[PDB]
Amino acid sequence: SYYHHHHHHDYDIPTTLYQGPRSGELWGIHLMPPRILVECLLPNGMIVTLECLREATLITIKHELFKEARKYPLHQLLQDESSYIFVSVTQEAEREEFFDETRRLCDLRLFQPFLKVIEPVGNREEKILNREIGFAIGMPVCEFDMVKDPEVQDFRRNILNVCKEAVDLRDLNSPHSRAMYVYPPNVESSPELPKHIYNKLDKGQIIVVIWVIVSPNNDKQKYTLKINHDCVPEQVIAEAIRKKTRSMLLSSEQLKLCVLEYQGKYILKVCGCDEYFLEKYPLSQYKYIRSCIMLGRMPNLMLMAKESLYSQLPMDCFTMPSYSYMNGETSTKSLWVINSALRIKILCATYVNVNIRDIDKIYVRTGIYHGGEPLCDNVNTQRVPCSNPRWNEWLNYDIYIPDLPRAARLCLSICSVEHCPLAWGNINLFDYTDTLVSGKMALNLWPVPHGLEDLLNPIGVTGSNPNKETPCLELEFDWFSSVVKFPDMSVIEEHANWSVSREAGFSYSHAGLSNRDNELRENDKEQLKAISTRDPLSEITEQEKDFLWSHRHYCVTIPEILPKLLLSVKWNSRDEVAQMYCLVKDWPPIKPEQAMELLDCNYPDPMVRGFAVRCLEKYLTDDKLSQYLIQLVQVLKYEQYLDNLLVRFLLKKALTNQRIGHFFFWHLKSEMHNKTVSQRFGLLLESYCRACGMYLKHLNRQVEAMEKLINLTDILKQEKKDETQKVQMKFLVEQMRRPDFMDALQGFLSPLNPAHQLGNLRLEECRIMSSAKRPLWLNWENPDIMSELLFQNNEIIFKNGDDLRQDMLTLQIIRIMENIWQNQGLDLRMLPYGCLSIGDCVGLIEVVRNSHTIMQIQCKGGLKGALQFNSHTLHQWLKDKNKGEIYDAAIDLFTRSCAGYCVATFILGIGDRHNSNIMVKDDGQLFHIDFGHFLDHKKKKFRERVPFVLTQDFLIVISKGAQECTKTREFERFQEMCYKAYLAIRQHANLFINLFSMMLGSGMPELQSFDDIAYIRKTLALDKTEQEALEYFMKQMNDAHHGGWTTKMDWI
Amino acid sequence: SLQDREEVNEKLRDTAFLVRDAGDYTLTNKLIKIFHPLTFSSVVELINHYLAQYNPKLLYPVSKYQQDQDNIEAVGKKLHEYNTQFQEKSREYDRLYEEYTRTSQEIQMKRTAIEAFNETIKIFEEQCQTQERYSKEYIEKFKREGNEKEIQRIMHNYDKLKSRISEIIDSRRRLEEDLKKQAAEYREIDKRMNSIKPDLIQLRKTRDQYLMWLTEWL
């Protein structure tokens, strides 16, 4: 009677191929069996099949193949084994000679189980540790050597400028400057503190503790000082030795001479991890100190002897690889000499996958672009619809060839008929050598792939798909009797001064003032600054574009206005652009947070971008670089050509600063599998790995480790699925006990923080978590000498399955909010735990000890009789930790953290917060995990929602043990934090708008286009006033909680 | 204005003009302020009038009421049926993208696998030719020297080597024809996505028809 007896015939249960991203040690098989048959091919021609062990070294199988070749024919024709080396084909499909013969059979990635013997061809065998680089990069280096494209060959050879220069800078004041590279100081951007931190110091003094180790070494020694927060390490080193050596047998004078000798032989190291205080900064400017201040901790430093630190730092010793009018060009013709409009011949798409029936007709659409468009889109005529389609037409684009701006691009697609796109591609109208393109080109196309209903897609990547098996589309680019080039800077400045002087003598009348004297209007002169302060997505009217464009020379006094100005320029005017080029030449620098906007997808022009790089070169600190390193790396994707200013800028800072270098390496490597960027990023990785010194060997351990964990988890997620956790855990431990695992997963640096060493695995405390993606919870001994003062055991989570890089961004934004708030007075303690995407849906996530979800809290306190959970269980659990004077502070923390997170989750619009999304620490801090879809992707089915809705539970904790908790003064002070915080982020809205814009380069489906970012404009309410936005925030907070949020403020 | 930004930009998506609130109003992306009240032709008559006539660098108004294809109650389910079509179509759309993705990565795994095969073979072809140098440099004896203690077992190596190669070339062959059907299956998935696309766009457009007329289920 339920379904009106209607059968579903189509339905069937057996494999419904209906789950309701995803090789290992050999081809097709993850884990090679413990004994295996390995064919050994020799110079004899004899293929003697050995059975060796999975985990056996090449040294072992060699010194056994030596002995068991004495049992086969032609023996005296085999040389001494010490004159031989192995080689085979790998899964990447190359002949990998096997030099480091300590390597085990399972680590070689062999495809087919066999070896071949040969002699050391290329006797410079130390040179053929490009292998290291290839391993590190995740593709072979020789794959670059056989690339035709000169741009690539030119990138590799010319980018060594930066490498060599940067290596010289490292060995300037050595071994100090080497230790600056290796152990750069970890310090905040401001030397002064916010006032709430200061006030935990009794008029600016920290109680420190210095530790020493003199032989027998066995013993260590506290030296507790009480010194100024702003005193440098040099001073703290002194006062520490004063105490050590003070005696009844030293006078004051004889003490000071002992101090002076000992002073300059030591430096300060943080206890329990490889951080170091290596230059003149206030102690509190270093982040460890400022963490210790806030957390309620006494800094534990250590006097490290400079001998024993400079002992650890090895020589980097870079060397250049095998890749080591007056020309045939004759600058043949300047672009501006040419007399015709652009036309481009489209002819024949080789194939397209469309139905003859369903789709009626098809055509190749085209348009010329500069981000946004400089003429009408030129569709081609319909032909041979859905069945071997070829054209042979020229489309005539209304722009005179001299007008084409330096970064102009053909954007094309192929559409259907009721329109939808089939495939797409774009081309740089100028090549990397400033040459305007001519001849025929073969543009292999991309899929749309998802979402993108728009016909053309110019925000996508330039160049052809490196998959040959795609819609190809041949086309001819017009030829002007001779090779064309973009004009020199000499030419453009000359034309600028001309059209500048041509302005000066124009008539009294000119469509009034449609696009244009020194009469400096005073209402207008305030309209510029009003527009200057607007957000990047506040769409500008062409009236304002002219208005701006006309007073261009005035705008130079408000340098901040430039992003608005540049979007106002007509790029299909050679005249306007030439003058803009000359403004940008002299234009004075702007704040790095604005300059970053000028490396997003709307500003392609090399001159504009070179400016942006120069702003960052002067103004952006190494601290603020490593904050914003993610965006800067994703913004390389939008650069036209391989060699450019921004890549040189980043490659240099990566080779300056091993903390940057590390994340600069990982951030490229993680996007490597993505074939669109694959080539740009590899060549860059190749240049970095070649120049970074011994760190390459540290990375190779990190990579080698990750591969093991990827491989282990793959076996768990396929095959060992549908097995009890008890079974899976017997497999997990068996495998980590294996010796190749022990090799690979023990001596290395946590990629989440290379500062923290990972030593021996405590298998005891390693386990496969409950989640279906089978994340591994790993746990290593901290092999530091002072592990006791930080953490005896470092543990982090490895998750193969989820795409981390969304989390990666929201945590980044959270950190940036916390810092805005902190230095603007407001203490709202967020916890942006560490997360790192290291590959296609694979990553690492920091654990946060002594934290549990609200669900777990409620199960401990949850009364044995399973009726209902009480809301007070949280509040009671929190009291049971925090008793006495403690208790009040534990609430203060909760209230502060809750508020901070209330604001951020509303603003970012992250996934709905339920009980297993929110966690509470024993000390009483609240923080969110697993954020999911961030700018409200969940509206695409059917608003402006509050995802963090304060249940009764939280409100109690906020107001202490309470009845009617929304009326308390505790809750008022909470409400005020939200109002001060919400405004604070709003006042820095530009940064977040840009930060998101820069992240359109990544493949994340929550950032497809600028209209996805629009949400963040609504929720911060920038089209309204700040008093309206406040009231909007209060409104929306009132809506979700059902009352509470009706208030007023005294200060405006 | 005669009553009888984010959403204005979103509704302008997929259209090769319209009036909006804030100057006090905005003709729309190419944004035109209505500041340019207080002029000839009371607001609305300036809109009917039209663009080169003032601006150097310069037919389809959008306000269809969408009764084109009367209840309030019954039209409420005409969303609930079209949106279930839309979402079941959407579900099927993005179902095949997983297959489109998985197959394409599976495909490129096969050619890179085939390159390893091809290359592996070239080492085995080179190995049978390695012995015929070094075996028939010592076939000098042929019959004598304790009969055939050498040359019988040399032939066994050569026999396995060649029959091994045999199996490798079979394995590649097998993979190459695996790739072919996969190539055809890939193309076939893309084919049905392109027929679904405009059905899915029209269904999403016609879902907007029954939404915007009316201005729980979903």
Ligand SMILES: Nc1ccc2[nH]c(C(F)(F)F)nc2c1
């Ligand atoms: N503290 C600090 C921060 C960034 C710096 N960049 C340079 C360089 F001289 F440009 F290398 N010196 C710096 C010192």
